[PDB]
Amino acid sequence: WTATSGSCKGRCFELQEVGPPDCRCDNLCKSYSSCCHDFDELCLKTARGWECTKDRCGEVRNEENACHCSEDCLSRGDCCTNYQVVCKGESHWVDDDCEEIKVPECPAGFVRPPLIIFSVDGFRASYMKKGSKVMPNIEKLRSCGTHAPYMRPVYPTKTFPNLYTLATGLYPESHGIVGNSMYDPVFDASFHLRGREKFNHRWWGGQPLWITATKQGVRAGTFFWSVSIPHERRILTILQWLSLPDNERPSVYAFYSEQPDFSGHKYGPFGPEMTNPLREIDKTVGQLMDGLKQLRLHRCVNVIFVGDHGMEDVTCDRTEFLSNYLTNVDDITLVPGTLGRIRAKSINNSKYDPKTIIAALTCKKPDQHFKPYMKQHLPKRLHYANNRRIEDIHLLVDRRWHVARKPLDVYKKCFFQGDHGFDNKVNSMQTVFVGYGPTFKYRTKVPPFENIELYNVMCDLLGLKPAPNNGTHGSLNHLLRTNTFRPTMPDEVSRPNYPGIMYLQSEFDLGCTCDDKVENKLEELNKRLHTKGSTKERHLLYGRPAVLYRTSYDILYHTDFESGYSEIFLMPLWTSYTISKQAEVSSIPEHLTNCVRPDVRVSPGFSQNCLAYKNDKQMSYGFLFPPYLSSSPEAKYDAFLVTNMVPMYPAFKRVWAYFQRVLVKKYASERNGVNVISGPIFDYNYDGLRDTEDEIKQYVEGSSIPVPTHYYSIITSCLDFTQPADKCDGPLSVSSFILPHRPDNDESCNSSEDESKWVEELMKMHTARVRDIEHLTGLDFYRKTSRSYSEILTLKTYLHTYESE
Ligand SMILES: *[C@@H]1O[C@H](CO)[C@@H](O[C@@H]2O[C@H](CO)[C@@H](O[C@@H]3O[C@H](CO[C@H]4O[C@H](CO)[C@@H](O)[C@H](O[C@H]5O[C@H](CO)[C@@H](O)[C@H](O)[C@@H]5O[C@H]5O[C@H](CO)[C@@H](O)[C@H](O)[C@@H]5O)[C@@H]4O)[C@@H](O)[C@H](O[C@H]4O[C@H](CO)[C@@H](O)[C@H](O)[C@@H]4O[C@H]4O[C@H](CO)[C@@H](O)[C@H](O)[C@@H]4O)[C@@H]3O)[C@H](O)[C@H]2NC(C)=O)[C@H](O)[C@H]1NC(C)=O
Ligand SMILES: CN(Cc1ccc(Cl)c(Cl)c1)C(=O)Cn1cnc2ccc(N3CCN(c4nccs4)CC3)cc2c1=O
Ligand SMILES: [Ca+2]
Ligand SMILES: [Cl-]
Ligand code: NA
Ligand code: NA
Ligand SMILES: [Zn+2]
């Protein structure tokens, strides 16, 4: 019950929302069907439209009108946006030359530059160039402010997960809005675009910007708008709020547009019907800028123009149906469309097997336009697993396609020509970012970045301390004229040990064998210099990684590589080596095939053993530094140390051995040397964070040797590839991956073929930011460079995507 028989007189678009059963006049009341009886009359006036005309200039104030052209309107704060243009001979904002905003030029009483978020649904990145002739206000924002060529949304590339990601800096897995449609098994309730369930706070985690603002004494209301309030009224409302007295006036404002997504769905991303929605969004931006100029706020406010996701060509005939794969299709519930999420229809079924379903969906058709995954096996870059609302079975749907359960689901719901929600690396899913105002830089291009980063920037723009989030604070410092956040490197928590030769060969009982005892004083202090770290500047280019948790580990130096050896996990946390453009690939000699050597620097008790691998029929082993890239036959012996060995499934070894033997050399050839840091990752609970010892679910049979869930590599070179990796004076170039450590290659449908047909493609899918690797390892990389820390932060957030142009 709302006793909707109070009034909105003097209360239109009030900022504080009022408690029941007393009726509401806030910008959300229409959503709850709880507005006072007079809201439309008072708060949603439309009379005479949205523009001033000559015949309206200097009129007698008529309170019925949607906006005013009378003399008093400036001081009342409620002119039509074009008032100064029509009735004062002033020019539109878009027609003024763009002048650098060196300092905030605000009216008296403004304590700080207000922030205005202008968000646009389904605004694909390429619209910036492709729609440029019809969007002059937007193009002026772009060229005059700071802009990226695109901004990367989060997966799934749906509206709600992305807008709430913008507001919180959190992955959907952490904020809870994991889809446009969601079932929570605990709530036994469903969240939809339609309906009243979405209004419940229990779905929405994290701390949105407006709450971060309010708690630190910066005024801000919700970013939400009821859909029935037209766009013109939203602009006029924001402009009215901006006219409030200093102690009432909010510091942050948000405008939302359902366009161009709405038409995009009907007409496809580039349908001839798409020109008009783009025109209209530009007009709206123009109204806001004219309005700000009127209030002399146009060189005072910071404006963000930002989209939630792109739009792809998708039609009904491009639907894969699960009923073409499964016979038991009525046993399952599917979240359909541009992604798939499958769960049991009845939770009262103990004869329900996810394994059998995955298998029935795996590589079943040659053309297959989806790939099934257990959620923990999804690419770690998607960060799409750690939430009870995310189904164990996920379908990654190919761009341009849909998944549905049965044909009846499509025809009894062709309506659509456009959709979105695909993998966030997909070009068509990319969206937009423009920043304009005194705090942003002038006429500046920045590289593409992820929408998870914006929360921190908006906090900075408002003098707020950000709530804990998934951005890397400082990675977007290059967007801003004046910063206020100075990032610092996390302190190293564990200092390494530097062990010398401490054990005799006969102290080891590892069950290992090596054909090695084929024994000059010239070449003998030289070998000792390598174990002491003479070649360390060659192979460790950016300093040792800092271990950011409490542990026991040893630095181990060799001719060809250096490692950080964990006495707890019985393997390296990292292994660092440099392969120049000129270096040679050799083989593992016949006599050294099964060679594993005790490391006289590390105790029997802190070493792996060969017996464990013999007894484990599933588990083989591989090496972190590759023997194939030894600099000399004699240095090759170092690669076979027990301290360089890691557990590997035979199926995974196909992947690793091809990466090591072929790809590292290919990257060194193409990039003029590479530095490689490789290591294990443990993430049994799939939270995207380093597991502690007692979270490990699998060991090599009969041992304390823990089994990695993933293997990483960070591959760094000089951005200017005319300089070799090991002599590089300026910025760096990086690509990384996090390969899942799996006992089969079911993920790669062509894996029965030569590694050269499938291995590289898999690695590409599992591309990663260094930052992802840091969370997963508790390591901190690039500690010693000639580069600024902000630049290094940007580098750590880079993701090599592998998409075309
Ligand atoms: C992306 O950024 C975010 C934010 O920085 C990172 O996520 C954080 O990770 C932390 C570690 O995983 C986690 O800290 C824990 O908090 C626990 C209390 O959590 C509540 O309070 C906070 C603070 O206000 C709040 O944010 C949380 O909100 C969550 O929960 C509700 C649902 O109930 C949702 O509305 C909301 O969306 C959010 O859900 C998300 O997080 C939860 C986990 O909290 C997930 O389950 C969801 O899937 C979803 O992703 C909470 O309301 C607290 O219990 C923890 O303390 C334990 O661990 C410490 C370790 O030092 C130890 O000392 C203690 O012993 C303690 O153990 C005890 O509890 C155990 C479990 O109950 C029990 O087994 C033991 O026996 C002990 O009794 C811990 O401090 C933090 O909550 C989240 N924050 C958010 C917002 O998600 C995230 O990691 C980043 N991602 C990446 C990849 O880097
Ligand atoms: C599509 N857009 C745009 C949009 C803008 C910004 C973002 Cl961040 C997003 Cl995700 C979407 C809508 O605005 C649609 N729409 C409409 N009417 C609503 C009415 C009440 C709610 N509730 C959400 C939960 N809840 C919370 N209060 C504080 C924290 S969570 C109560 C309010 C939500 C809506 C709502 O979403
Ligand atoms: Ca973990
Ligand atoms: Cl969804
Ligand atoms: Na074995
Ligand atoms: Na396969
Ligand atoms: Zn949409």
Long-range contacts of 497-500 (CB under 8 A, 24+ apart): 497/552, 497/553, 497/554, 497/555, 498/554, 498/555, 499/554, 499/556, 499/601, 499/602, 500/601
Residue type, 179: G
Report CA(158)–ligand 7 centroid distance (Å): 7
Backbone angles phi, psi at 346, to 5 degrees: -115, 120
CA Rg value for the chain: 30
Q: Return the C-alpha torsion angle 274, 277, 282, 286, nearest 10.
A: 160
Residue 325 CB neighbour total at 10 angstroms: 17
- Answer yes or no: is 180 a known binding residue: yes
- Answer yes or no: is 616 a known binding residue: no
Is 159 catalytic? The answer is yes
Three-state DSSP state, 142: helix
Backbone angles phi, psi at 773, to 5 degrees: -65, -35
What is the rounded distance in angstroms from the CA atom of residue 608 to the CA atom of residue 705? 7
- Alpha carbon separation from 246 to 108, 210, 217, 241 (Å, rounded): 9, 18, 13, 10
Resolution (A): 1.7
What is the rounded distance in angstroms from the CA atom of residue 523 to the CA atom of residue 546? 33
CA atoms within 13 A on the CB side of 534: 8
Q: Which two tokens stand for residue 225?
A: 């708008």
Which run of H or of E encompasses 393? Answer: strand 393-397
Mutate to test the pocket of ligand 2, among 17, 192, 224, 454 (most ligand atoms within 8 A of CB): 224
Evaluate: CB of 31 within 6 angstroms of ligand 2: yes
Q: Which two tokens stand for residue 760?
A: 């590289």
Exposure of 403 by Cβ count < 10 A (0-12 exposed, 13-18 middle, 19+ buried)? Answer: buried
- Alpha carbon separation from 280 to 417, 553, 628 (Å, rounded): 21, 61, 61
Three-state DSSP state, 652: helix
The full 3-state SS of 717-740, as one line of letters, equals EECCCCCCCCCCCCCEEEEEEEEE
Residue type, 438: P
Helix, strand, coil share of the chain (percent; to 5) = 30, 20, 55
Backbone angles phi, psi at 329, to 5 degrees: -60, -20
DSSP state of 268: -
DSSP state of 329: T
- Expressed in angstroms, the distance from the first to the final Cα of the chain is 55
What is the rounded distance in angstroms from the CA atom of residue 76 to the CA atom of residue 49? 18
Q: Are the C-beta atoms of residues 22 and 3 closer than 8 Å to each other?
A: yes
Q: Are the C-beta atoms of residues 575 and 625 closer than 8 Å to each other?
A: yes
Q: Which ligand is nearest to the CA of 195?
A: 2
CB neighbour burial string for 236-270, b if at least 16 within 10 angstroms, e if fewer: bbbbbbbeeeeeebbbbbbbbbebbbebbbebbbb
Evaluate: CB of 456 within 6 angstroms of ligand 1: no
Mutate to test the pocket of ligand 1, among 174, 375, 683 (most ligand atoms within 8 A of CB): 174
Q: Which two tokens stand for residue 43?
A: 């708060």
What is 665-711 written as a DSSP string?
Answer: HHHHHHHTSEEEEEEEE--TT-SSSPPPGGG---BSTTSS-BPPSEE
Evaluate: CB of 223 within 6 angstroms of ligand 2: yes
What is the rounded distance in angstroms from the CA atom of residue 42 to the CA atom of residue 304? 30
* Pairing of β 674-681 and β 710-718: antiparallel
The full 3-state SS of 400-421, as one line of letters, equals CCEEECCCHHHHCCCCCCEECC
- Nearest Cα neighbor of 186 from 198, 202, 173 is 202
- Answer yes or no: is 689 a known binding residue: yes
Report CA(641)–ligand 5 centroid distance (Å): 18
Q: Where are the alpha helices (DSSP H) in 472-542?
A: 522-532, 536-539
Point out the catalytic residue in the list 81, 146, 157, 159.
159
- Answer yes or no: is 780 a known binding residue: no
Evaluate: CB of 137 within 6 angstroms of ligand 1: no
Q: Which two tokens stand for residue 137?
A: 């206000």
- Answer yes or no: is 685 a known binding residue: yes
Q: Which residues contact 59 (CB under 8 A, 6 or more apart)?
A: 68, 69, 70
Residue type, 204: W
- Nearest Cα neighbor of 738 from 677, 665, 784 is 677
What is the rounded distance in angstroms from the CA atom of residue 582 to the CA atom of residue 584? 7
Largest CA distance in the chain: 106
What is the rounded distance in angstroms from the CA atom of residue 159 to the CA atom of residue 724? 44
Evaluate: CB of 160 within 6 angstroms of ligand 2: yes
Exposure of 210 by Cβ count < 10 A (0-12 exposed, 13-18 middle, 19+ buried)? Answer: buried
- The gap from C-alpha 159 to its chain's centroid, in whole angstroms, comes to 15
Residue 91 CB neighbour total at 10 angstroms: 11
Residue 351 CB neighbour total at 10 angstroms: 5
Whose CA is closest to atom 33 on ligand 2? Answer: 199
What is the rounded distance in angstroms from the CA atom of residue 637 to the CA atom of residue 528? 14
What is the rounded distance in angstroms from the CA atom of residue 621 to the CA atom of residue 593? 12
Which run of H or of E encompasses 84? Answer: helix 83-87
What is the rounded distance in angstroms from the CA atom of residue 608 to the CA atom of residue 703? 8
Counting atoms of ligand 2 from 1, which one is nearest the CA of 204? 30
Evaluate: CB of 629 within 6 angstroms of ligand 1: no
Whose CA is closest to atom 12 on ligand 2? Answer: 224
What is the rounded distance in angstroms from the CA atom of residue 421 to the CA atom of residue 441? 32
What is the rounded distance in angstroms from the CA atom of residue 587 to the CA atom of residue 603? 30
Three-state DSSP state, 54: helix
Q: Which ligand is nearest to the CA of 359?
A: 6
